[PDB]
From a paper:
LinA variants exhibit considerable differences in their thermostability and enantioselectivity. Among other things, H73 functions as a base that abstracts the proton of γ-HCH, leading to its dehydrochlorination. The C-terminal segment has been implicated in the catalytic mechanism of LinA proteins, where based on its spatial position, the enzyme is thought to be in an ‘open’ or ‘closed’ form.
The structure of the -type2 protein is understandably highly conserved compared to the -type1 protein and therefore it was unanticipated that it would exhibit different enantiomer specificity for α-HCH compared to the -type1 protein. Further analysis of the active site and interactions of the substrates in the respective docked complexes were carried out. It was identified that residue changes K20Q, F68Y, C71T, L96C, F113Y, A131G and T133M in -type2 are vicinal to the docked HCH moiety and could conceivably alter the contours of the active site to enforce enantioselectivity. Amongst the ten residues that differ between -type1 and -type2 proteins, two residues viz. Q20 and G23 are important determinants for this property as seen by measurement of enzyme activity and CD-spectroscopy experiments at varying temperatures of a series of LinA-type2 mutants.
Residue numbers in the entry:
A (entry chain B), B (entry chain B), C (entry chain B): 2 to 149
């Protein structure tokens, strides 16, 4: 469980990246496969959804229909092993995006508070808790592609 | 190839960081040593350059002469092993900088699509593909050092 | 020292994250436990402080009383092993925050230049050197929580 330790770390960094990538590239597959069935994704000011079912439900009915596109930058994944099978973790995340509402470009700073769990040697999200530290629409800036 | 796996991961995260660092700190050495000779660096809206030769050619003739300075923030490196010797990968990258043109401060959000390859136990870039999601000059902000 | 290598890497990424987290979540514990006693934290334009004593002294007497809150995004941690016991490293870091002064929202781009050292199999900061590349107060933006 010292090699095994490094292995878990890897496993989870991919899970964390995959949470983010699956929201930005809107990939249902990637996104649904990271949650244990009793997992809870909570986003402050939205609500709690449970399981991959609920994860996909939030993606399709709230997140994706709210923003033309988003990009989440995830850093500082700081893990703490409670047992070789349960991990808690923080990440700071920066997100840029265009709201459908008013066609607005906005900046979210968030802190994600996580819980990971192993079952049959396989690692998945137990709980993800999103907390928005900053929500700031940018006055005289609109994020656009290079061809406008 | 389970320890060997973690090793490759490390190897590549350094390659990815080195791509970025070598553009921001303008270090020819660091930058030239990460490309296999038949590698292609493609940056949408600029062109494709092949090999370390071409990598250094773009650095000196387009990138560096265009910006007074840049800083690239690289996150979410998500690897997929196709064989113990070929890897595909995404990273989201945030870049801040001053264009020589109009002395403008600008923000690029990019997505990099990568291909890594091992030869004689050593890892290098096979293909890097840059795609700019956001190109936004900032209206009333100029990034400056603290001493202005 | 090939498994041992990957282990050190992990050890330090946590140290690096912990530097940042302990400044943003203002956690004295987390912050004090990462410095060898003869370590130097230098922040250009502020000064040098040495040891955990000095680290906590800067936190409580300069950093924390200057900003209502900060969030540091740390990426590109690029390590170089000088011996299996001394490492040098760069990281690029992005920081957002509200200054108490004028209740201003500002953006710091920094480059951190680090030195790590092992003693009795345990890894700690030897030297951290902060250099601010950008210090830019944002004209018509104030970072706020979502409830304002």
């Amino acid at each position: 469980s010292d090699l095994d330790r490094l292995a878990s770390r890897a496993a989870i960094q991919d899970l964390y990246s995959d949470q983010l990538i699956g929201v930005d590239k809107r990939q249902e597959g990637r996104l649904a496969s990271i949650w244990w069935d009793d997992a809870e994704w909570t986003i402050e000011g939205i609500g709690t959804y449970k399981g991959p079912e609920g994860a996909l439900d939030l993606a399709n009915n709230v997140l994706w229909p709210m923003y033309h596109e988003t990009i989440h930058y995830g850093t500082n994944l700081r893990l703490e092993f409670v047992s070789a099978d349960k991990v808690n973790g923080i990440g700071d995340v920066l997100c840029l995006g265009n709201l459908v509402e008013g066609n607005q470009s906005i900046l979210i700073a968030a802190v994600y508070t996580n819980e990971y769990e192993r079952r049959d040697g396989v690692w998945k999200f137990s709980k993800l808790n999103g907390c928005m530290n900053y929500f700031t629409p940018l006055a005289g800036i609109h994020f656009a592609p290079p061809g406008i």
